[PDB]
Each structure stands twice: as C-alpha cells, then as structure tokens.
From a paper:
Peptidase-containing ABC transporters (PCATs) in gram-positive bacteria function both as maturation proteases and exporters for biofilm formation, quorum sensing, or antimicrobial polypeptides. Substrates of PCATs are synthesized as precursors with an N-terminal leader peptide. Proteolytic cleavage of the leader peptide at the conserved double-glycine motif is necessary for secretion of the cargo peptide. In this work, we determined the structures of wild-type PCAT1 (wtPCAT1) in the presence of substrate and ATP with or without Mg2+.
To analyze the conformational states of PCAT1 under ATP turnover conditions, cryo-EM samples were prepared using wtPCAT1 mixed with twofold molar excess of the substrate CtA, 10 mM ATP-Mg2+, and the creatine phosphate ATP-regenerating system. Among the 671,000 particles analyzed by three-dimensional (3D) classification, ∼83% exhibit IF conformations with different degrees of NBD separation, 14% are in an NBD-dimerized configuration, and the remaining 3% do not show any protein features. Subsequent refinement resulted in a low-resolution (6.6-Å) NBD-dimerized structure and three molecular structures of NBD-separated IF conformations, referred to as IF wide (IFW, 4.1 Å), intermediate (IFI, 3.7 Å), and narrow (IFN, 3.7 Å), respectively. The three IF structures share a similar overall conformation, in which the two PEP domains dock symmetrically onto the intracellular openings of the TM cavity. The leader peptide (residues 8 to 24) of the substrate forms an L-shaped structure wrapping around the PEP domain. The double-glycine cleavage site (G23/G24) is positioned on a narrow cleft on PEP in close proximity to the catalytic triad residues C21, H99, and D115. Consistently, the density inside the TM cavity is separated from both leader peptides, indicating that the cargo peptide inside the TM cavity has been freed from its leader peptide. Densities consistent with ATP and Mg2+ were observed in all three reconstructions. Different from the NBD-dimerized structure, in the NBD-separated conformations, ATP binds to the Walker A/B motifs of one NBD, distant from the ABC signature motif of the opposite NBD. The majority of PCAT1 adopts an IF conformation in which the NBDs are separated, the substrate is enclosed inside the TM cavity, and the PEP domains remain associated with the transporter core.
Author numbering:
A (entry chain A), C (entry chain B): 8 to 722
B (entry chain C), D (entry chain D): 8 to 24
The structure:
C-alpha cells in the first residue's frame, strides 16, 4: 500500500508514534494519547516491552528479536520497529517499511521518511526488531475524529459578531473599489477638458469616501480583536479545566513543560478559527469581484495578472518546505547552545576549580558557529524567495504597463482606464496572495489541533467508578488489604499482596528502607491510583463504591515534599475549605506550634508568602502541612515523613497532639531511618517489596530479625 | 521468526527516548 | 533642579538604583555594577545596611531613621530613601525628592517618577527614611563612558564590507530613481504621439534596469546578513569569555537567569551598530536626493509631502511612550499567570488531596481576564495609531493628487510629470519614515548597552593578587590560618577569629553542624574568596603571593552537589587536563572502584550521558567525583561528605586506598557524620562558627565538655 | 537629625527586593 509516518508531538514518546504509524498502515487510526496510555510511556522514554504489550492488546501477534548484522533474509514480514542511536547520544525508535539491496526505507517519526544505506543503518541500528502481524482479532476500526469541527463549535454562540465583521468587510471592499476610479476620472475627463469647478467637487467627494473607509476599518478591527480574545480565552479555560480534572497518571506520564506548552497553542487554533475562516470568505468574495471587474475592463491585461499570480503561487509552494526543514534545525541548535550555556554557568565551582576555562570557551564558540551556520542557511532561503518574488512582481508590473500602453496605441483602451486598471490590481492580487500564503497557517493549526484535542478525549478521573453511599456516612472502621497489587506504569511490580489490617483508633507505623514501597500504600489508601489485582476494605466496605469527594475530604495526607503556594498564610492554611471561623485556625496552629513564627511575621496571619517560602526554611515550611491537615478535621490522618524538624520540643509536643485526639481517627505514620519509633499499636517493616515483619511494641525486636538487629544497633 | 526470541528482562534493558 | 531617576536593569537591585540616582543628583555618576558590588546585594534583595555602608564609603554623611506618620517638618534634607510595599506583597526601595502639602515626589526606580497623595504614601511606606548629605569628602566627577563608542570598535576591522554595502545601496538608489520616470515617459511622449517601435525599446530598456536592481539588492542582503552575524558572534563571545573570567562574587550576587539574559541582548546592540548606522547614512543620502528632486520638480507639491511627514512624525512621537507603558504591564501580567499555572500543575498532589479544583480554576480565570484586559489596552493603542497614520497617509495622497491636477489645469505641470512625482514620493517618504521610527531602536540599544557594558568593566579574579615564583616552587605545605575573618556579603560574620595549623598530618577531619561554615573554610583555603583580616600561610608564605594557576590546579576538591557535564565519561573525567594516558584513568577508576558500574554500561568509557547524567544515580555520581579529584594527583585533597549508599564496603575500599598512598600529601575531610571520623588523627569541631575542641578522638572524649554527649548519644 | 536613630540590627531586619 502506501507508506505512512506520524509525527511526534513530544520529544519523550517514540514507540507510540511507531505503533500508531503501523496501525494506520494496517488500517486502524487511534488518538496518540490512547496509544501512550496503553504503552505506559514514562518521562524518561518509551520501553520496548510497552510496545510489545500494546501490540498484544491491539490484537497484533508480535515478537521482539535481536537480529544480526545481515539484513538480507526474505522470510519475515514488514513493516517492523527497530531502535537507532542518534549520532551515538541517545536511543530512538523507528519503523522500517521495505528493504532493498542497498536502500532501507526508514520512517523516522522525528523527521518524515528517509532512505538509509545498509552499512550506515547497520552502524546506527543496534538491534531489537519488533515483528508484527495481524492476529485475526485485529479489526480495521478507527476511533479518530475531527477536532476542528469541535473547536469551531465555539464560534456558534458568536455568530452575530462574525456576521457583522463580514458585512463591514463587504462594505469596506465596496468603498475601496469605488474610490479607485479617482485617477481614471482625473485623467479622462477632468484634465483633458480642463473642467474646473468640478475638480474641487470630485476631490471633496472622493475625500468623503476615504474618511468613511477608515471608520469601517476601525470598527472591524475592534470587533475582530474582541472576537479573537473571547474565543482564545474560552479555549484556554476549557483546556485548563479538563487538565485539572485529569487523573494522576496523566501528570506522572507528562512533564510540567508539555502541559504548559499545550496552553500557548490555543492561539494557533484561534488564528485558524477566527482569522483564517473570516479571511477565506472575505478574500474569496473580494478577489472574485476584483477579477470580474478586471476581466470586463480588459481581458488581455487580466491574463498577465493571472500568470503573475500563478508564478507567485508556484514559487511559494516550492519554497514552503525547505523553510520549515531549515527552521527546525535552528531550533535544535539553539536548544543545544542554551543547555550548554546554562550547564556551564551553573557549575562555575567545578569549572574554576579544575581550570577548564579554555575548554568551555572553545566548546561554546563551536556551538555558536553551528547555530550561526544554520541561521545563515535559513537566511539564504529567505533571500532566494524574496528575490524570486521581487523579480516576478516587478516584471509583472512592467509588462502590465507596457501591454496597457500597447493597447492604448491601437485605440483599444484609454490611459485613464489603464491607471484605473493599475489601481484595481491591488484588490485582486492582495486577496489571492493572502490565500496563497494561508496554507502554512492552516497546516500548523491542524497540527496544533491534534495536540490539544486528544487530551480533551481522555477519561476524566471521577467517571470510571460507581458511587453509592446512602447506607454509610462515616469512614471510621478498619483498613484491610486483600492481595493488593500495584505497578508503576509498566515496570517491576512494587506492591505485592500486602496483607494488612488496621483496627480503628490504633497508632500505626510503617518503617522501611529507601526503594521499598511505603507511601504507595497511602496513595492507594487515598484512591489516587487503582490496584489492578485485589482491593481494600474500610469498615467492611469497598473503596471503589465510596464517592470520590468524600474519600478525599475525610482523609488528610501530608507529603514528603510540602507544597506552599503563593498567597497569604490564612488562605494557604485554609486551602480547599471555606467559611471557617478564625478560632479554628488559632487552635490548629497551636497544635502544630505555628505561633512561634506567627508573632515573628510582620502581620499576624495575612503575611504574604513571597513566591514559595523564599524567606522560609525547610524546618519552617514543614510546620504548615500538619496545621492544614488537622484543620481539615481528618477522620483518617496519614502523616508522612516529617523530617528536618530540628526541634525536640516541637516533636514531643506534636507527638502528644496526635495522642491527644478529641475524635477517634486512624493515624498512619510513615517513618524512615528508625526515627521517632518508641511505642505504637502496630508496626510494619517493609524491608523490600513483600511485607515480612509485622509486630507490635516489644514484640518486633523479639523476632530476632532485621528490626531486632537494627533496634539494638541504634541503642 | 528471524533470530532468537527475547525474554522480558531483555525487553527491560532496551529503552527508547 | 533636575529630578534624575535611574531605571533598574534587574528586578533585585533597587537600593543600588536609588543610591545611584541620589549620587547623580548631587553630581557623581558610577556604573551600576560597581554600586551594586559596593552595596553587596544578595539574590533575595538589597539591604538597607548595605545602602548606609555604601553611602559612608562614597563620602556621604548618612543615617537611617524610623519616621512616624507625621512628615510635615522642614528641618531635614532631601532627597532621601524610604522603602514602600508594592500593594502589600513585597518591599521596594524608592527615593523621595520633594514634599508638598498633598503631593509627594516619589521617584520609583521601577517606573519613572510619580506623585503620591499623603494618605496613600503614608499607607505605602513602612519606615526608615535614609538621610544623606555631602560630607565634604564628596568629590564630583562623571565616571561613565559611552560604551557604544567601545562596541562600535568592532566595526573598524570590517570597514571594507560596510563601505561595499554603502556603495551598493547608493547604486540601488540611483537605479531606483532612474527607473521611476517610466510612467512620465509613457504618458508624456510615447502615448500622446503614438510613437510605435519606440515603446518596445524603452520597455526593454526599463526592464533591463529592474533586472539590475534585484542583483544589487541580493548582493547587499548577503553582505549585510554576513556582517550582522559576524559582529553578533564577536559580541557574544567577548561577553562569555569575560564572564568565565569573573570572580565568584559575581556568580553569587547574580542568578543564572540574568547572566544568560545578558547574552540575548547582543542582538539589540548589533541592530544599532550594524543596521541603525548603515541605515542612517544611506537613508539620509537617499532622502536628500529625493527631496531635491521633488523640490525641483515642483515646490507646491513638495510642501504637502513635507507637511505629511511632519504630521506622521508628530503622531509617532506622541504615541511612542504609551505603547511602552502598555507593553510593560502585559509582560508583568503574563509573568504572574505563567507562575500561577506552573505552581498549580506542579503541586497537583496537594490540590487533588485538598479538593481545591474550583479555587485554582477561578483564580486562573481571573488572571486570564487581567492579561486579556492589558492586551486589549495595547490593541486599542495600536488601532488608534494605525487609524491616525492611515488618515494622514490617505488624505496626503488625495491632496497631492488634487493639487497636481490643479497645477496641470493652469498649464504649470504635465500629467506625466505628475505621475513621475507620485512615483518619486516613494523614495522620499520611506527614508524619512525609517528615521522617524528608528528612535525606539536607538533608545533600546542604548539601554541594552548599559547592561552588558557595565559587566565588562569589572575587575576579574586574576589581575588583583601579586605573585613571585621564586619563593616556593611547590604548593604542598603546612597550612596555618592566622586570624582569618570572612563574611559572604554585608551580613552576620560567618567566621570569627580562628587559628588553625596542619603540620603534615596524615588525616585532618573538620566536623560541626549545619550552618557552622565548615565547607566555607576550605572554600577560603582554595582562594575562592578572600579573607578580610588575617591570612593563611603555607611554608610560611602567604597565599596572596602564590600564582592563581598553581594554587588552583594543585588542590583537589569535591562539592556537595557534584556536577556532571553533558559529555562522555572519558572527556568528563579528565576535563581541564587533557593529553592523559589510559593508564591514569584506569588506575583512578581502580582506586575509586569506578569499574563496578562500568561493566554494566553498554560502552566501557565512551558512553555518552544524558542531560547532567540524570539516569545515573547520586551513589555513582559521588564515585565519579572522587575519581575526577584523584585523577589530578594533587598535593592537597579536600574530600567532602561521601556518604553515598549503605554499601560500606566502598567507603572501606576508599579509606584503604587513601591509607595505602602512604605519602606526604595532606587530606582535609569535611563530614558531619560522627562515626566515620572515629579513626581520625586531628579533629576540629567547629561550633557556632568558632573552633572549640582540637585533638584526637580519645582525649576529646575524656575532655568532657560538649563532644562527650553527642559521642555517647550516637553510640 | 529627624527622628530616632537606628542600630545595626534594626537596619539588618529591613530589606528590599
Ligand atoms: N514516579 C515515581 N515516583 C516515585 N517512585 C516511583 C515512581 N515510579 C516508580 N517508582 C518506584 O516506586 C518506589 C517508591 O517507593 P515509595 O515512594 O513508596 O517509598 P519511600 O521510601 O517513601 O520513598 P523515597 O524513595 O522518597 O524514600 C521506588 O521503587 C521507585 O523506583
Ligand atoms: N551565598 C551563601 N553561600 C553559603 N552560605 C551562605 C550564603 N549566604 C549566606 N550564607 C550563610 O552562611 C553560613 C555558611 O553555611 P555553610 O553552608 O558554609 O555551612 P557548613 O557548616 O559548611 O555546612 P552545610 O553544608 O551543612 O550548611 C550559613 O549560615 C548560610 O546560611
Ligand atoms: Mg518516600
Ligand atoms: Mg556545608
């Protein structure tokens, strides 16, 4: 059939692009976001086992093989996925389509489709050919749709403004056409017959027409900018709302940069919907009117303009692609130089200590030369295009004028009519030129519409569960785990049958070592992630049936890295909650000993937090999360690693606070390095993976296990 | 089949980017 | 007299701007970089004590006062510095110049000079008027120079290219002027007399002239882009080299963002030197030629064009300032929205746990509305300017055409001459319009030259210290600290008077607590910072008499946050000292046990890392650090905290290797961990910034004091 | 003088930005 390659929206994903291209070749189109979710792409990069598992899921009978140097066997199916090394820096998955004696068809997802020599491919391709076939369950079905017909829906409530803009454009065109015959009337009647006292009147009349064109232009500009802002704001706001609604997998898979980057491309979509839709209509109509007038006025002078337009279109279409192929390389070379500069100035300690002053200077000089060369290539392309367009335009103008003079000589047209023709050409060349150069805008808008329109199609967090809570209004109960299994994306499982039982109102501590999954127990206990195998029970009830908002309202969760957002202490400390009395904050800050800095700050509680704890320290920022947690009235408190306190009295006061609870609540404490482990109701030691040592106070040490040896090692 | 099939850990060691 | 206000380049330096403004008012100009160095600004912000110290240094009799609400007294001098609060978010030093009954003249360094009402001002400024007077040691003098005549020096070696560009532009102008009479010749001779067989010849002749203008345009474009790239590269490279030469105070005072930002403004300087100097000459000459031609052709039609130029210039000059005043606010409102978005998407754990999905949505909607309003204000300004310019241009065109017709009616001018005048106006209006709109470019270039050109005027690290090689050929020597005092800036002295001696000890161990300044001691030993009082002696010789290169290459250092460059292990490991044989790297790896993870890597030693070695964990990162340190084979080693992982066998091997050296080289180990220093010979305990106990561990335990309690607390 | 003079620490607590 036909070779198809799909581009990559993000630098992180390559296997998803290859798998989507292969599926499209076999006749199945899916949104790249779904493909990424199936493969479990991480921020570091795509794993080939993700590709093999996604292929199995889609119905492709697939297998990964480490092939030798020889690529001449005939009995194996194509296309297939193999990895390559980008000039021996990093890996990059690509799909090969057909092999020849010395030509290999290599569809690079990063850049189009290319042909490689056998030796160069064998050097770049380390191994790992992923052979794929349809397994008779593969059904030729495509879930892909049109995003633009969905984003253009936002133009429906604003039909009045669009229609008014169109009417204003039509009247602007009419006045501009009418005012262009001033030179014809001047050089055909007013000067030849020297009809004075009419020149003043006609001049005033044509002045009035121009003081009316500017009003229409002003009004149209006001309306169009208002429309553009109104639609751009709505696009941005819908995207932000849906992102805020997305589950945690979306935030773990993608970085912050990509999510914020899908926020600046709403302007590109707006340009197509607002600018590139109105301009099509108005320029098409105005070009048609101008062309008809030009043809009626003289056909021979019209053919010359038509030829000029054709030449300009041919030149622009030819020069379109080399410009992008040169603009991408400049971006790559600037991205390298900026990283080099930041890396160098960040590590001045090491550079100065080791004496590498000349080496970094030479390296930066070379990178600057490379980016200069790429910019010069783009400059040469622009100069070539501009020179060709200038030659075409100037020769067209001279030819039109000469042919007009030749027509006038034979008594076919009048000189004033020639000047009117020259004036009218501005209303036929400009509209068509706009549509000729509009194609790159439409293409980039279509590209950017598939980067935001695929995110909106992911299943939002709340929907995938059934909610029913008429029977129970409380979280109080026991925590049970039944062979709960969790797996970060597609990697080695962490949580594995963590049989647990937490009676109500028990002091619980989970100790372990770095690497062992211990906060993951809390994360599943708070319904952030979902266990694929097994389930957890509260009060003998499944967490999946529990409503979404209640399971995150009655459970308080401190984080290892506490987050402090820009604002005042009051609003930050009462995040999420609203309509509270000022005494609750006072007592909450008294439990966590916040007053020790409350009097220190210039304002009691309205002190602003600069950017994020810029004037604060870690040992102080730590003392805010507990206050908020206790403020939320937690029926289940999950106190995470509260390190860097550096205050014994604060520890023994805060510890007492937990013991002295007015309302019975299941406290779950995450501890590390055997810190503040004196006495608890239940103590569980996660040495690695599987839970092994689950013993109470003066019961764990007895096991003579690792807890024992560590406990008599500490003291 | 072309060569020798791979195990899950051999797929683990192979990554992209 | 003159109310001078200095505009800050960076957001952090406010006190420096205020002090420079006051000094300029009394008649003394300094480079803002030097004022900033004298006042000692931290990245967090300026200090008032720094301002009082700088005023004392410059000779100003100065004092800070906590003024009350009442400020109606006459008996205190102005101008004076007070701090205000920017809508109750953050502090901002500003200078007041004159007070009235209800008007206060407040020269905000951030934005021009403003007038405040008494109530609003008294609400805005907290306290601390800083009063300054000349102290009779104050000598007037202007130290500033025109850095532009210094950056234009780069144009001197490239005089041939500039002259060739100028000659090409002159010939381009000549051909353009000559080719503009085609319409005059057409409508005055060739059509009136119907002289056929001459129309073809003249058309071909004017076609040849236009196919020669494009060649000159092409050649000029090539030369000008080559010149621009060549000068921009030189500016960038000089700045980068000098930054790499600057001492560590410059890097501690400034952030990474500012240093990299002074790298993108070389383009602005190049635009003035390369573009805005050639354009001045060529456009002035071509405008003079066009104006003379128009005046000779007809004076009456020339006056109308001159009036149009005057109107356009007036409109542009009037509208220049409000456009900048509106563009700055848009940048501020985007900088707020971007920070809000990044902060929100970064802390999704807390937002989802607390259920604040609606609060953040509302806040972002409000910020989006604010930025839309600011953009609409800028849009209204642009539309107003464009409408006024369009009215002026259109009315000028109509009036010129009508006056030309009126002149033709009374037998004063010919119609072809009128068309020639209309064609020629394009060679007079365009050059003058270019010079009219060139003023903002010159102004921003001048601003950008004061922010890159002041950095180049700082004294680099190498020039200060004097040295003689005859004294001590070697570097390794007994270390003696004599009364060393040091503070990072104008803050609490980190180091008080201390006395140390290292008499060729096998091991030296410096232990203390966080914030004591243990690493700062070694940082001062390596001559990164200089001691205020006292000195350090090696072989009874001051470090200030030793060459920088020898003292910098013979001292091996390990940082807390080890830095790994983006390159292969081979080049990363031996940076600074190239031409190193494989045996040295292999034995350094053997001593550091670097081989253990090397076998797992796909390539033994040429493996290319990712950005800063993200995939590599910190455990092997430290091992790379010790390998890099020991590669130099130095005289003195300063080994910082190498805790790494609980794999104690690696630390045991490292200690065994160091003991197996059995050499006369000295080792200074900085470690907070108490157990690892059990086997050390000389142990210095630095508490509260002063050395307290000195000697071996066994006698330190029997000395009671304070070491005893921690030693028997750990074990 | 205008009002009450300040010590070094009172200047220290005052910062800018
Ligand atoms: N995105 C991720 N963030 C954190 N850990 C992850 C992630 N993906 C996989 N993991 C794995 O999950 C485990 C983290 O365990 P967990 O965070 O529960 O333990 P912890 O001891 O509290 O953590 P820490 O490593 O901060 O001490 C590790 O094995 C880690 O490799
Ligand atoms: N730019 C700066 N760099 C380092 N320290 C600074 C700086 N400005 C102020 N300080 C302060 O100076 C003191 C020096 O601390 P330093 O980091 O040298 O401590 P240390 O005892 O060597 O150990 P640690 O690395 O654990 O902090 C600290 O109180 C620190 O807050
Ligand atoms: Mg953890
Ligand atoms: Mg330190």
């Amino acid at each position: 059939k036909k070779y198809v390659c799909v581009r990559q929206y993000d630098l992180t994903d390559c296997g998803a692009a290859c798998l989507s291209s292969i599926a499209q070749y076999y006749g199945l189109k899916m949104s790249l976001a779904k493909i990424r979710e199936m493969t479990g792409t991480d921020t570091q990069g795509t794993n080939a086992y993700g590709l093999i598992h996604a292929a199995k899921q889609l119905g492709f009978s697939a297998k990964g093989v480490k092939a030798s140097k020889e690529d001449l066997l005939k009995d194996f199916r194509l296309p297939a996925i193999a990895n390559v090394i980008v000039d021996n820096r990093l890996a990059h998955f690509v799909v090969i389509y057909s092999i020849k004696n010395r030509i290999i068809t290599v569809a690079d997802p990063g850049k189009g489709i290319v042909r490689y020599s056998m030796d160069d491919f064998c050097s770049i391709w380390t191994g790992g050919l992923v052979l794929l076939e349809p397994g008779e369950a593969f059904q030729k079905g495509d879930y892909t749709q049109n995003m633009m017909v969905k984003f253009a829906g936002f133009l429906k409530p604003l039909k009045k403004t669009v229609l008014c803009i169109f009417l204003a454009s039509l009247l602007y065109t009419a006045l501009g056409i009418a005012g262009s015959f001033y030179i014809k009337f001047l050089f055909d009647d007013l000067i030849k017959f020297e009809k004075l006292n009419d020149l003043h009147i006609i001049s005033a009349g044509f002045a009035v027409i121009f003081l009316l064109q500017i009003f229409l232009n002003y009004y149209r500009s006001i309306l169009v900018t208002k429309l553009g802002m109104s639609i751009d704001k709505s696009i941005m706001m819908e995207y932000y709302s849906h992102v805020l609604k997305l589950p945690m997998n979306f935030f773990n898979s993608r970085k912050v940069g990509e999510i914020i980057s899908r926020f600046m491309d709403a302007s590109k979509i707006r340009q197509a919907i607002s600018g590139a839709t109105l301009t099509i209509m108005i320029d098409t109509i105005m070009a048609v009117i101008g062309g008809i007038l030009l043809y009626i006025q003289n056909s021979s002078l019209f053919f010359i303009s038509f030829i000029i337009i054709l030449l300009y279109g041919i030149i622009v279409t030819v020069f379109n692609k080399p410009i992008q192929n040169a603009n991408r390389q400049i971006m790559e070379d600037n991205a390298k130089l900026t990283s080099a500069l930041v890396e160098s100035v960040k590590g001045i300690e090491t550079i100065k200590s080791f004496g590498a002053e000349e080496q970094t200077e030479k390296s930066t000089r070379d990178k600057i030369e490379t980016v200069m060369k790429s910019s010069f290539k783009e400059g040469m392309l622009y100069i070539n295009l501009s020179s060709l367009t200038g030659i075409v335009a100037g020769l067209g103008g001279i030819v039109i004028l000469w042919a007009g003079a030749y027509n006038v000589i034979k008594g076919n047209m009048s000189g004033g009519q020639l000047l009117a023709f020259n004036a009218l050409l501005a209303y036929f060349l400009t509209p068509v030129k706009n549509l000729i150069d509009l194609q790159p805008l439409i293409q980039t808008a279509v590209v950017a519409s598939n980067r935001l329109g695929e995110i909106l199609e992911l299943a939002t967090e709340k929907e995938l569960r059934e909610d029913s809570d008429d029977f129970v209004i409380s979280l109080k109960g026991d925590i049970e785990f039944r062979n709960v299994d969790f797996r970060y994306g597609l990697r080695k499982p962490v949580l594995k049958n963590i049989n647990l039982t937490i009676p109500k109102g028990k002091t619980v501590a989970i100790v372990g070592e770095s690497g062992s999954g211990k906060t993951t127990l809390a994360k599943l206990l708070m319904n952030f992630y979902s266990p694929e195998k097994g389930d957890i029970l509260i009060n003998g009830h499944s967490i999946k049936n529990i409503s979404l908002e209640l399971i995150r309202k009655k459970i308080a969760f401190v984080s290892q890295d506490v987050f402090i957002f820009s604002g005042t202490v009051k609003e930050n400390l009462c995040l999420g909650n609203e309509n509270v009395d000022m005494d609750e904050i006072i007592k909450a800050a008294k439990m966590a000993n916040a007053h020790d800095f409350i009097e220190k700050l210039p304002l009691k509680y309205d002190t602003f937090l600069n950017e994020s704890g810029a004037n604060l320290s870690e040992g102080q920022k730590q003392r805010l999360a507990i206050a908020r947690a206790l403020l939320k009235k937690p029926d289940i408190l999950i106190l995470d690693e509260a390190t860097s306190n550096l205050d014994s009295i604060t520890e023994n006061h805060i510890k007492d606070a937990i013991y002295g609870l007015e309302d019975d609540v299941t406290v779950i404490i995450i501890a590390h390095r055997l810190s503040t482990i004196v006495n608890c109701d239940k103590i569980y030691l996660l040495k690695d993976g599987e839970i092994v040592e689950s013993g109470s106070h003066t019961e764990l040490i007895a096991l003579k296990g690792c807890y024992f040896k560590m406990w008599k090692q500490t003291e | 089949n072309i060569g020798r099939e791979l195990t899950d850990e051999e797929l683990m060691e192979m990554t992209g980017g």
